[model samples]
Target: ATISNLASDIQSQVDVIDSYLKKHNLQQPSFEVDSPSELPLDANVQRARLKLIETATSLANLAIGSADHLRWHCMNNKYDDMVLHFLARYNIFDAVPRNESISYVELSQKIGLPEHRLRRIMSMAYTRHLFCEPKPGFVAHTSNSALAINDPLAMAWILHNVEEVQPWYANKLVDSTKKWGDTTDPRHTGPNLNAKAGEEKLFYQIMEEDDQGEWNGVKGKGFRLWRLFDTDKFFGTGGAIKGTNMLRAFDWGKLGKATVVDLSGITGHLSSTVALAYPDLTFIVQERNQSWLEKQFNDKLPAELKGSGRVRFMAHDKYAQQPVKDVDVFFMSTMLHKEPDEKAITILRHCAEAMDPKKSRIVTRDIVLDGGDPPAEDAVYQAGLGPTGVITRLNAGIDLQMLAVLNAFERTREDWITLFKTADPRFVLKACIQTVGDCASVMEWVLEE
Candidate 1:
């Protein structure tokens, strides 16, 4: 295929975007300091942009040609990361004035890093357009650079992924494959080998049990950054997860005290949504630090529901046997993917052993890889079906991250069924419901008598 065709295809997609912007008087996107951070356009406009980039990415790579492309890519010296890591680590982003430039000498005095390293770091930052050079040695905040201050969540994501996730585990992935071969033993995964601890316990277990001692005077400064991994976007209502449609996925008949155990349910955000919707149900959220979670739940929950005995937190770890037995539903939100298949099966079985065959069911809300266009009736909605693979890169990266960290994998719908069967033949998949804006599917499994 001629490269001209790809350029031609890119124009049509760009045309739709340009027409929409002109018609609606939306500002055309740019890297200028005054430009908008992200477009305010709808999903249809996003699909057009997506198509434009998808091909533009191809054409740009194509322009470089395959051999040189690999040369440039494999040359991945991680100079970009050198800038990012230090900027996030040292709080350099805030040092530069948003509206004005700050001299590198002054920036070094404020940030307390060497001026020479700052020069090198900023050199890499330019390739990324992270900051703008106003005068000779002065740095100004470009639109991209200004984003780190404006969006803490995005900054937190970078901190978590770059400083914690990748550093601890990503590089040793190949070494892990060499040593473990095909078994994927939880004890000998990439992160395990890198961290020098996974010989006896899983990575998350290591992270939870870390108890990183005081460095100088600061506490939790070591592995405590794990808390920076913002989950609200994944589990909270106003973010990616649509709580209203998920509420309908589980049956809520009250034969009274209809209880739901939110296993490892961080922040109790999802259950709070259900607690408001069904008003008569009881919810108990389980996590390792229940006291801390109690403080959070108390701080955020309604004043009336604070001491109502309707919803509360319990100190429980994921590996332990289920304590709350025969509940209406064991609601697990985004918990299973952290585990490898074997551990995930054991987790389900632990809950299954505690459940009553006649009344109890388990509902898990997590990604179902390749579960496209959910098999629901006319009422429910789908995301990214208009342009398939729109979210593929996101989920694909998550899948690989799952692999590196805990020797885990993102599940397919078929994987769900197989894991259920192995966990217990009596377990039957009741529903696989997904709605618009849902980060993952809500699959319900009922126990068979």
Candidate 2:
């Protein structure tokens, strides 16, 4: 299995290897493909590794002792908004390969921007290497810039980051200055966003705690991936499913077999994709807020998906209050724990109530808090990190990153199981698929019934 995984990893390297060859213009014929048993690493190539190490160290230094690395990203989002508006005006990109060149004079006329101003923006984009700078005053789409077709996922991914996750950052900033009784803590609680008298002040007050989803911001927009289907044109189908089939791996195979309802699904893209893959699946997507649900169904869903009867979009005030019937599987991802324990319990209880006690299953994957309890930390660490000192550091580093991201995270395998037991002790862990970048646990909760 390791060898096969290595082979797959090597295959992905082929494109990079070929691009490197082209970049340096090395000998082609001399490197016989059939009998290519040996390849030499150039001095520059070896130095590249050293450069990466140095750059990473510098970044680490900057990141250390900061509230979060995401602070920079949040501070700079005004620029991103400018870029988004700029691109939105012109339907700025296209998919299929361009057979002819598009001149700036033409683009200026279409976008209503002065020639020089448009020229400057495009030039800046080129410098950023967002597009290919073939020559002065002549900007062409580079492999990097060709998202409409080249990498359809680029726009959606960017939007997801910007809009979907904006609230997370926005909340924190707002909360930081808010006075919770006496002390100023960004983590302070406030009243509802729609509350009449103190709403405006309260809205701003919660900003400190409002980190992730900020109204059509990247994080909120990102929710469309699962909550809404039509908005996916921005994220084109070509860009879906990078390597593994997320649905299949998550036991969403019966997407076509049973009624599938996604709680907190933003745009229903995941549900829609499943519908596309298996037309038989009935996909009902729900979001907590009505305003968000309205935007997703009316504005986000593209024309093609809206016509599909297999999917429906709805609004549910809260997961715990809403009860869905005939549900075979209740799917939730990245939506848990935005609030304190009370809200999460409501969600879980709601899901528990919605599912058929006899046969339905709940599959969830969320950031589990690393509560320090039970077996002491030293004992757990000594046992897990027995032979690998480096592994322990790596694990600690991961926890650091999670903390840096403003996650009130905690958990162990035992912790996750205990939560399910809280809902119903009969549930058991069927699979725990761990991811590479972070120690992501893809957990499954099955009803004992």
Candidate 3:
């Protein structure tokens, strides 16, 4: 019966996609590497396509989960990082001969790894679509593999995960759970355990030490700077552009010539993005890291943003009270999940204190979990199976990541409401808005006067 329902869901999603494509006068998207770089469709069409893919993926996964021994197969699915770590460490992507395939034996000889081991690793990587085997014994690059060859950030991301995060922090996940049960301190996470071998230190403390070269006596230094810079690249220019959900969630035109304080806005990229789109809004980009803010303001920030004077940078700590008062909108993105409930409350209270009851609003853009399998009446569930399936799973995985690194979590709708109530009884949750396919959503709050 579940399978039947899933099949029906798939058909319904397909019908929606067909109708959307026809309406938009657009061809179906392709998986080919050389396919059109852009889809010239409206937001609604894009959202529909996203739903189609989500439904298709969920249907496949559901079938896989239901198959005999398939759940067990997935449960034991490990070593995802093995091939990626090998490729990154050996820099094999560079060694791959352009426009030709290379045998595992030749690749190993070039990279100075054991030929048999290299073959196994490449085969594993191929299983995940990282690389491909052209003729049985030889390996060639995929568009995915080509990223490591061409983009420094792509390589950096691979190395950051495989070399640094996985090696040092990820391995200690189980141990951390056993050690600190329901712990809320970021210092008590796996990264801290590995940082000192036995003792503990907070995530930022480790990063600060590594940034200053104080981590010379130990490793994880590579993680700090690489992760620090790589985060900006991913969230700022690379992945941020894909945040159509965030863009659609808010009505920026309504807040004409209003002041927005971007709390914990790393390098001001999200705010800069908003400023670029809505020139009428003024943004104050706040972050704790002064030097990095300076570097971003000088180097990464667009010349137009700097000249427009709509965006200004400020160095302020989130734990402390917000200095800028009476702002129209307090905007935070990719924050809150890094902090425990106590810290999140503190941050929220600070914003509440700074906000004006009549005009100011607080908009938090982050991964919001469904309040335990959203009921049929829920807006997200009403949309269909695709959104509920993808959003819930994505947030669940991210919740684990947050737990591993920060001992924090992605909050549910109920959890968010409780947090606001705890922070200030007067602060009311206005709405939670998400685009059809986006993982990120906006939680708007305002004071109840």
Candidate 4:
């Protein structure tokens, strides 16, 4: 490739004076990056090329700057915090004291630690409101803390992220920083922040399926950020999940009082969406990070919902698990797809066993893949479709993105129907919410007796 021409291209696009020089024609033509052949062999042409080279060089320095900031300020602390966050997500607090209330010292020893180390970390957790300092150097479980221990799977999920997903940051970011710098590849134009930051693999894996498992632990693992960012864009509170779709799913008036148990609802947007739409329904959201959960519960949820006890925050870890008993309704949105088929089945099976037979129902909405694209004008839909009826396409290269992050591929319609049956024979696919031009699929299932 012509290195000199590459530099000129940069000067033309980002250079302010060079851009201005083109319109009024006051400035000389020398600043504008010209074609490779047209570039003068003289020093003036060489100077312009050098300017482009400098800009490109600056980006390289910035990448290192950004990475250092991410590691020291954002990611490194996150590693240790993630360890505790994972425990909280899985409900470790609940389990450590599940058998009975004990001193903080006793609590630490149960998890195989001495009194002092537990106090050191737990005190830091206290600052974040993860635990309460009921008295000096002592702690007890809050209602939120109790929820985390109720189910260990929640904690397991968080651990899975550390084991499988963390690697994505290292590979996509650490390794590819300079891969495209001098290459003749159109896949990268200029510098990509995601590629530098290790996010592209996950994104590409979801969009295409060409990767060779580079992002095995990082890409498609969970919906903590998905529902946080994308869900509301398509399924706004006033949309299908809240409108006639909810009506079709259940009779809010006649049925027993229902609430949303948003398992792994990191940001609580889904719970907030439900609370805002249905004034009658309350929400008992179970999230592992108490600080994060309370921040959203107190600050994020609407005033009306918060005032009427319509929203309650619970801290549960991924592996620690929650007991689903006595809940009128358990709603998981955009989360089921993040799990593998077997684990997803186990989650549903437990939910089925814990649900109240007469009134409880499990509603899950996520994306699914169906083999082929439909006709330009056809009307007959296929069988084995999911809650959302939005088919999950096999995004080839994108699948690798998730793979790097240790996430799963989008499932086919058949995959979901089959998985649910395994979780519980009584589970019946009810209605599919296939909204046009959306990546979501809504599937409602009624538990069979």
Model 4: per-residue lDDT, tens digit, 163-264? 434543334433443554422222332224345554344432332333322221224433233222333323334322332344433344544456656673
Which pairs, if any, clash in model 1? none
lDDT of 1 by residue, 4-115 (tens): 9989988888888788889889998776677775543355565566566667767877898978986887665466775788887778878887788899999999999999
Q: What stretches of model 3 exceed 4 Å from their correct place? A: 1-12, 22-27, 36-76, 89-118, 135-149, 191-199, 211-226, 232-241, 290-293, 371-388
The candidate that achieves the highest TM-score relative to the unseen native structure? 3
| Segments in model 2 whose C-alpha atoms lie over 4 Å from true places | 1-85, 88-99, 149-197, 200-244, 254-256, 288-309, 320-322, 337-339, 356-358, 365-418, 434-441
- The local distance difference test score of each candidate is 0.69, 0.49, 0.68, 0.50
Which scores better on TM-score, 1 or 4?
A: 1
lDDT of 2 by residue, 1-449 (tens): 24445345444444444566688776432211122222224323322322333334344545443575577656653665556545544445551124334677776766677878776666555544455445555545654455343333455545543543444433443443343332222233333223365443332233223444532332443334332223333432432112123443464654447877777366666666666666667778876544345554645454666756567777776544655678887766545534334556677777777777677777664433332121121124321132232223444544432332333344567766777777666777776553221223356777775
- Stretches > 4 Å off in candidate 4: 1-256, 318-321, 371-401
TM-score of each: 0.76, 0.56, 0.79, 0.43
Clashes of 2: 51
Q: Per model, how many backbone clashes are there?
A: 0, 51, 0, 72
Q: Alpha-carbon error at 444 in model 3, in Å?
A: 2.1
**Better-scoring candidate (TM-score), 1 or 3:** 3
